[PDB]
Amino acid sequence: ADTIVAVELDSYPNTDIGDPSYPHIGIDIKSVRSKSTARWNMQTGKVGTAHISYNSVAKRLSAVVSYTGSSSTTVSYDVDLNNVLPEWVRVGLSATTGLYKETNTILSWSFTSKLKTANSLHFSFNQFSQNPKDLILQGDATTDSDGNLQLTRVSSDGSPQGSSVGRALFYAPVHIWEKSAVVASFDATFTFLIKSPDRDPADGITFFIANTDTSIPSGSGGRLLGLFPDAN
Amino acid sequence: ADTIVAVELDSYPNTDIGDPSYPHIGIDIKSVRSKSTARWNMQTGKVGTAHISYNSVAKRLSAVVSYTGSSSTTVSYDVDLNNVLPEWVRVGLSATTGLYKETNTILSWSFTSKLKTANSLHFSFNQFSQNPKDLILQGDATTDSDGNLQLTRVSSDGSPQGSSVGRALFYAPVHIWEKSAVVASFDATFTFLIKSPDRDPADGITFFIANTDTSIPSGSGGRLLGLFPDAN
Amino acid sequence: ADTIVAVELDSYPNTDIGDPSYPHIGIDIKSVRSKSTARWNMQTGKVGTAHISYNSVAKRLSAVVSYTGSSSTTVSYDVDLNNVLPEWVRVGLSATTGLYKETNTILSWSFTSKLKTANSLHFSFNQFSQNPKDLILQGDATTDSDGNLQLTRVSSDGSPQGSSVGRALFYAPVHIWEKSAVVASFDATFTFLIKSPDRDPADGITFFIANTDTSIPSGSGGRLLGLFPDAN
Amino acid sequence: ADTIVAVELDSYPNTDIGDPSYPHIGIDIKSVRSKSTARWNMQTGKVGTAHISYNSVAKRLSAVVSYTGSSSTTVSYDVDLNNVLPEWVRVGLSATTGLYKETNTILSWSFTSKLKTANSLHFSFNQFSQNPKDLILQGDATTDSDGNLQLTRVSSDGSPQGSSVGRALFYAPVHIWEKSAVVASFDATFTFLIKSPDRDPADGITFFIANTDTSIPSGSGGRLLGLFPDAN
Ligand SMILES: [Ca+2]
C-alpha cells in the first residue's frame, strides 16, 4: 500500500476511530490515527492559513493553522522522516466529504524542499489554472473559474456535495532525502475555504507526502481523508 | 515539429550554416541560425557560468557567459516569447559532439519561472543524483558518480566521445504565460565544464524552452545541438 | 543633490512640467520629466499592484501596474543603471499630495537585488509593523494600526490630507553593481490603495533607487513626488 | 549586557569553563556554557559548511557542520527563542583567536528570516566586497582581496595572529517575532576556512543573534568568542 505522512485538518471528530472529541489538526504517520493532535477552533466560512515545516536535524514535524483575528492551533511530532518515507516522494493535498459535508477549497498552495549534500524545488500556486499540467488531479478534484482548486465536489452555485474525495499532487517527484545528505528540509503553506450548510462539516483536508506513485486507495472516503484504505 | 527557443554556447563555428567565424553565444528563435550572436572567448577546460533571463514587459531575452578571471560575453534579442512559444513548456539543456568533440558537463542547473495574474516554479540542481526522477534524460545524457550531468557521451577516464547528443528537461511542465497574465519572467543559471583533446571542440551546449513534448528531432546531431531537424 | 532613478505612478497630470495630459506611469532618470511614459487608467479606491524589474545585460528598466479585472499599463526605458546610479544605493517608496490629494497607502512592499561576480538581498513587507526598525521613515510617512504604511498624511477616519510628503527607504544599503560584476538585477513589487474625495487625485507614488544618503529635497512637494528639488 | 543566542564551532576545548574535552559544536543560550554540545571532528585546512535553523512552532534550534567527504556533526536544543531574545535583533558572525590561533575565514554567509501574521528578510554573501556597507564590522574583522571576510586578524601571507577578535553583523535589524505572529523561522548558512600552524587551533567561530545594539563586550576574547563578558 502507499506510505503516507500527512498533516490533517480534521473538521469531523470520528471518535469511533480514535479522533479526539472535537475538530482537530493532527500529524499522521502511516495511519489516520494521528501520532499527535491539537484542538482546532474551526471557523467555517472563513479563509484559513495552514503552515507545515520539517528539517532532518531537528526531526520535529510541525504545523500551524490560523484565520484572521483568530488564535492559532499548533501541533508537532518528533519523527525522522527518513525512517518513514522513501527518498523520492510526491507531495499533495487531499480532502473528503462524507455523510456530512463542506467545500474543500484551496486558494493557494506553496511548497519548498531543500536537500544539502544545495538542491531545491519550490512551487507557489496562487490561482490554479483551468488546466494545471503541473498538477496530477485525482478523484473529484478539479480547478474552477475563480482559479480555485476544489478538492471535493461542488455544484455550480458553490454548494458542496457529500461522499466525495479528491487530491492534487505536484507533477514532479520531490527528492527529500539521500544517502550522502547533510540536511533536508521542507515547508508548505496552503490557504483554504471550508463552507458548509451542515452544523458539523466533514471530513477535512490534509497536506501529505507519499511514495511517488501514490493514489486514492480503495475505501479511503469520508473519515479516511482519501489517504488510507483503513483506520488501523 | 518542436518549437524551440534556445540560448546557445556554440563552441564550433559552422560557417556553412551561417555561424559567425568564431566560437559564439547566440539566441535561437525557431532556428539554429541565431537571431543575434556575440563572440565568445572560450576557455576550454575551465568551469564556465551561463545566466539567461527574460520578462514579458521588457520582452528582451538576454544571456551572459563568464569564467573566473575572464571577461564576459553578453547577448540580447528583442522578442515577445508569447508570440513564439506555447503557454506550457518544458525547459531543458541540450548538447552535442560531432566529428570534433568535447565533454558537455553540467555542474549545476537552476531555474526560476514567475507568472503574475504570483505563480512560480523554482529548481536548483547542484549535484545531479544517480537516478534523477525529476529529470527527463534524452539521448546519451546521463548523470555520473561525481554528481555531474553528462549531456554527451564520455568514457570512464572522462574522455569525450564524438557524434553524440543528449538533453535534460525538467520533469514538470512550466507555465510561462497565460491569457490573464500581467507579467511573466524566468531566470536560468548553469555551470559547465567543456574539456577537449581537440584543437577546435564541438559542438556546444544550450539552455532551451520548448513545447511540452519536445524530443531530440531526427537528424539534429553535431551542429544542430540536438535542437532542430535542419538548419533552416 | 541626490541621484534619482524612479518609477512614477503619477495620478495628476502636471502639464506645465511636461506630463502627458492624463494619469500616467513613467520612468524617471535624474529628472521628474519621465524619460518615457504610458497612459494609466487609474481606478481610485481599488487595490493596485505595481511591478518593477531590471537586469544589466538587457539594460531595459520596465514597470507594470494593474488591478483586478483591469487591463494593465506597462512602460520600459532602455538605460544602463550603472551609468546613472552609484554602486551602493538605498531603495524606497515616495508619495505626495498637493493642492489636490489622495491616500498613498502601501499594503505590501517587496524587493530583490542580485549581484553576480551570487550576492543577493531580499525583503518582503506584507504588514508594516507599528515601529519598523528596518525602515527609514522620511517626512510624513508612518505606519498605522492595520499594518499599512501611509506615505502621506491621513486623519483617523482615513481621510487624506493635502500638501503632504513622505518616503520609506529600506534600512540596509543595497549593492546593485560592482567593478567585477557579471550581471546585476533587481525586482520590486508593491500593492497600493489610492482613495480620494477629489475628482482629480494628486500627486502620486514612486518606487525609487538613490544615493545611499538620499533625503526629501527642499521644495520637492506635490508634483515633484518628494523626489527632486525642481522639475528640470 | 547583551542578550546572546549563538551557535558555536568551538575549535578549542576550554575544560576550565565546562567545555567537553574535545573540539565541539554547541548551542549557547545567554551563556558560553553551551546548553547542549556535540563532538566535532575538525578538519583544519578544509572548507567547512555550517547550517543553522529554527521555527517557533517546533521551538527546536538545530545546527549541522560538515566538509566534503566527512561525516557531519549535528546538535539541537529545545528552546523558545521568544522567551529569550527581543523582537528586533541583529544577526552576525563572531570569532576569536587566543593564546593559540587559527584563520577564521568566512567564504559565504547567507540568512533567511520569516515572520507570519508573510514578512521576510534574506541576504546571501558569496564574496564579501572590499567595503561592505551592509555589514557592521566590529573589532578586528575585515574583508580582504579574495572577497573573504576575515573575522580575526591575519597577516598578508595569510598567517593568522593570536589574541584577536572580530564580528560581522548584518546592517539591517531583523524582525524575528511579534505579538500577533503565527509563526517565525530563520535559516543560516556559512562556509568557513580554519587554518592553523598550531596543533590545537583556537578559539572558534559562531553564528549569533542578539539585541540590536550588540557589541564586543569587554573581556570577551579567546574562549569567550567575542560574545560574553564572562563564562557564567
Ligand atoms: Ca475525522
Ligand SMILES: [Ca+2]
Ligand atoms: Ca555551430
Ligand SMILES: [Ca+2]
Ligand atoms: Ca504629475
Ligand SMILES: [Ca+2]
Ligand atoms: Ca572553547
Ligand SMILES: [Mn+2]
Ligand atoms: Mn483525526
Ligand SMILES: [Mn+2]
Ligand atoms: Mn551558432
Ligand SMILES: [Mn+2]
Ligand atoms: Mn509625470
Ligand SMILES: [Mn+2]
Ligand atoms: Mn564551548
